[PDB]
């Protein structure tokens, strides 16, 4: 039930053993020496991005503030609520930061165009939680700062995850993974899963439609690549 870790697997090995069957894996030795891994201090983030406006999810509402405000209020000064700079195309907004990352070569195995890969930043304090849900594209999730606990359930287990009925929320589970209501959601308890702690320099492959749940264990910065 652990996600396997592979060092720089060949494109063919990744394609045949993980991409085509839709199996998660952690890629080591791929992003570990990207510039972001050494450069992205809080101070560097403030210097490069501090004055720019970013969307922040407050745990639930959505607001806007500068990066400096986000750091001051939700990171450094004993925050009062949880705030998460989540799912934001920060690298389109701030092209200088795009210099510190790369598109993984494995994305070339997809059917889509490189121009259509979506690169999102996920920057927040210890304790951010993304509830269990599934996405409609493949994902490489690159961990830069801090660690994340991640739980993964196959699409084959969707019945045991009790998706919301609304079309809007049908890709999201009704269950709180880490404190499930087994009186209401009894099938959840026996559903098999994989899990990991994703650390800096590692890349998690989340296959298209794989259900995933994520909790930050430390001050955390991740970069995701959504591709097909
Ligand atoms: O890290 C998180 O809190 C949530 C993750 C990051 C990511 O790329 N996707 O699709 C998520 O759901
Ligand atoms: Mn997701």
Author numbering: 182 to 240, 248 to 416
Sentences from the paper on this structure:
We obtained high-resolution structures of JMJD5 comprising residues 182–416 (JMJD5∆1–181) in complex with catalytically inactive manganese (substituting for iron) and 2,4-PDCA (1.53 Å resolution), d-2HG (1.65 Å), l-2HG (1.36 Å) and the N-hydroxyimide 4 (1.49 Å). Analyses of the difference density (Fo-Fc) maps around the active site in the four structures reveal that all the crystallised inhibitors coordinate the metal ion in a bidentate manner and bind in the JMJD5 2OG pocket. As anticipated, in all the structures the catalytically inactive active site manganese (substituting for iron) is coordinated by the side chains of H321, D323, and H400. The metal coordination mode of the cyclic inhibitor N-hydroxyimide 4 is of particular interest. The metal ion is coordinated by the N-hydroxy group oxygen (trans to H321) and one of the imide carboxyl oxygens (trans to D323). The structure of JMJD5 complexed with 4 reveals that its ring is snugly bound in the 2OG pocket making hydrophobic interactions with the side chains of W310, L329, which normally interact with the 2OG methylenes. Our structure of 4 with JMJD5 implies stereoselective binding of a single enantiomer (the 3S-enantiomer) despite use of a racemic mixture for crystallisation. Comparison of the binding modes of 2,4-PDCA and 4 at the JMJD5 active site reveals that the binding modes of the rings of the two inhibitors overlap, implying that modification of them to optimised potency should be possible and suggesting that binding of bicyclic inhibitors such as IOX1/ ML-324 might reflect an approximate composite of the binding modes of 2,4-PDCA and 4. Furthermore, the functionalised 8-hydroxyisoquinoline inhibitor ML-324 (a JmjC KDM inhibitor)37 was markedly more potent than the simpler 5-carboxy-8-hydroxyquinoline (IOX1), a relatively broad spectrum 2OG oxygenase inhibitor that has been shown to induce iron movement at the active site of some JmjC KDMs 38.
JMJD5 is a 2-oxoglutarate (2OG) and Fe(II) dependent oxygenase of the JmjC subfamily, which includes histone Nε-methyl lysine-demethylases (KDMs) and hydroxylases catalysing formation of stable alcohol products. JMJD5 is reported to have KDM activity, but has been shown to catalyse C-3 hydroxylation of arginine residues in sequences from human regulator of chromosome condensation domain-containing protein 1 (RCCD1) and ribosomal protein S6 (RPS6) in vitro. JmjC (Jumonji-C) domain-containing 5 (JMJD5) plays important roles in circadian regulation in plants and humans and is involved in embryonic development and cell proliferation. The results support the assignment of JMJD5 as a protein hydroxylase and reveal JMJD5 has an unusually compact 2OG binding pocket suitable for exploitation in development of selective inhibitors.
